[PDB]
Symmetry: C4
Subunit: 80 residues, 4 copies
């Protein structure tokens, strides 16, 4: 990615790999290694994502928000 | 949250999202993005929570305690 | 514990909570909050433990070893 | 390992233990404590590995890449 990947990846039920980066994005990567989408947060993503039963991706950011991202990469909500 | 969210979220069986914050609280967030409860520890929560088979939430804190929190947000015990 | 708990806890099949500490020990805590055992490593335990299918607890330490601990708290092996 | 093990281990379905090290390698360790293989990345592995449904091991590295490693230790792809 654009920067160091400190976040630990989480795997969705279809095999999608989600991981944060110090370049401030949450990445969703297809199992073939091609980008599915990237979601820009405010700061570095030092949280490792967690996946909900309905596929929602949750990750903390250094901008003080907990993000909930839909599986298509659009923001579901952010909590401060 | 009040501060950076470094802790990685854990998801309960009902979808509740638990995550620590540098503002010293453990948060329980409903899947709709509304706060369920917050639990104040002594220091920053740099541990990622783990959920037991009975729903108990365990998380370490920088105050040197391992916390066990009931699913309703009340302290079950703390271990030093 | 003796020091900050940065490690994220892992839960065994019987509910035992395993977590590392900056006081250099891996703790095994019963769900009632009483100590089961503690295992001394060389340095701080900044790795979060993982539990194998046979109950073995694996954790990295800052002494450069990956530890494998039996569920009764005795060393199974260490890898450098 | 050659250096501190900060990464948290992941366990494969056959019991293989995967863990990163500050010596820049991802290790695959058999449950008997013998090395299966090691994979050299560019920098320290501060990400904890995740294992896919087909056994692929994913881990971030400080060289800015997300690595996908086959269970036999050969690179599947790297994403930047």
């Amino acid at each position: 990615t654009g920067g160091s990947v400190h976040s630990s990846p989480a795997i969705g039920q279809d095999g999608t790999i989600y991981v944060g980066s110090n370049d401030h994005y949450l990445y969703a990567i297809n199992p073939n290694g091609k980008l599915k989408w990237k979601f820009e947060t405010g700061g570095s993503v030092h949280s490792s994502p967690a996946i909900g039963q309905d596929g929602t991706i949750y990750v903390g950011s250094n901008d003080h928000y907990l993000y909930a991202i839909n599986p298509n990469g659009k923001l579901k909500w952010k909590f401060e």
